[PDB]
Amino acid sequence: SELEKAVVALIDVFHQYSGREGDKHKLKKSELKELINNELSHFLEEIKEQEVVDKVMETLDSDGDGECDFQEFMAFVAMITTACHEFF
Amino acid sequence: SELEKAVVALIDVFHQYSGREGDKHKLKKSELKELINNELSHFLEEIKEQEVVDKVMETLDSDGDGECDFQEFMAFVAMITTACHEFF
Numbered sequence: 384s385e386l387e388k389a390v391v392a393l394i395d396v397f398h399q400y401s402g403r404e405g406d407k408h409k410l411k412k413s414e415l416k417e418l419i420n421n422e423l424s425h426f427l428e429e430i431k432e433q434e435v436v437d438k439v440m441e442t443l444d445s446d447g448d449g450e451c452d453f454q455e456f457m458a459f460v461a462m463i464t465t466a467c468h469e470f471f
Numbered sequence: 472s473e474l475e476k477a478v479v480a481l482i483d484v485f486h487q488y489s490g491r492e493g494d495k496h497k498l499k500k501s502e503l504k505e506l507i508n509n510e511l512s513h514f515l516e517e518i519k520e521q522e523v524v525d526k527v528m529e530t531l532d533s534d535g536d537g538e539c540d541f542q543e544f545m546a547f548v549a550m551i552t553t554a555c556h557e558f559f
């Protein structure tokens with residue numbers, strides 16, 4: 384179904400980005416930035432400044448380790464979906 | 472992108488199911504049951520018993536109003552994705 388498709392897309396995109404460098408299970412700042420810029424260009428403004436990279440991670444980073452893990456990525460997804468859900 | 476596709480699929484599926492009866496913004500038990508049975512047949516066992524319908528809603532229903540709203544649907548999605556994410 385389309386829902387099952389969306390579930391595996393969420394898994395797949397996190398993984399193409401998280402596995403690039405360092406911890407293959409977490410998104411560092413440069414990997415988060417590339418995900419947003421390449422994969423969310425219709426929902427979010429392109430990130431061009433280091434201070435925005437820094438602030439975005441600061442916001443997503445619930446447990447405070449400096450990176451975005453899968454659960455944190457999932458909360459980020461829920462935020463965008465809710466924002467899109469109620470624009471309409 | 473495939474991620475933006477997944478975001479709009481999440482919105483769309485909740486809405487086709489929630490708007491069927493009563494509150495057009497919330498999933499009652501029969502609407503939740505149909506969503507899981509029709510749209511999650513590869514991830515979850517088909518629900519055939521009222522006690523399972525009752526227990527599933529009890530689990531998803533964080534604020535205690537007897538129905539599943541959008542934020543609660545989003546937490547349910549995060550649970551299935553995490554379960555699927557780490558099966559592999």
Ligand SMILES: CCCCC#Cc1ccc(C(=O)NNC(=S)NC)o1
Pocket residue numbers: 425426427462463464466467470
């Ligand atoms: C082509 C679709 C564009 C039409 C549209 C839209 C729209 C309104 C608000 C958002 C959005 O996702 N923002 N996310 C935020 S503010 N951060 C969590 O997206």
Ligand SMILES: CCCCC#Cc1ccc(C(=O)NNC(=S)NC)o1
Pocket residue numbers: 513514515550551552554555558
């Ligand atoms: C065709 C794919 C089947 C292969 C597979 C798989 C798989 C393992 C675990 C789950 C799952 O989503 N369970 N969700 C639960 S337990 N409730 C929150 O799915």
Ligand SMILES: C[As](C)(=O)[O-]
Pocket residue numbers: 402403404
């Ligand atoms: C070694 As690689 C292509 O996952 O950065």
Ligand SMILES: C[As](C)(=O)[O-]
Pocket residue numbers: 490491492
């Ligand atoms: C009136 As209807 C087709 O949204 O249940």
Ligand SMILES: [Ca+2]
Pocket residue numbers: 400401402403404405406407408409410411414
């Ligand atoms: Ca990484």
Ligand SMILES: [Ca+2]
Pocket residue numbers: 443444445446447448449450451452455
């Ligand atoms: Ca973190």
Ligand SMILES: [Ca+2]
Pocket residue numbers: 488489490491492493494495496497498499502
């Ligand atoms: Ca309803």
Ligand SMILES: [Ca+2]
Pocket residue numbers: 531532533534535536537538539540543
């Ligand atoms: Ca509820």
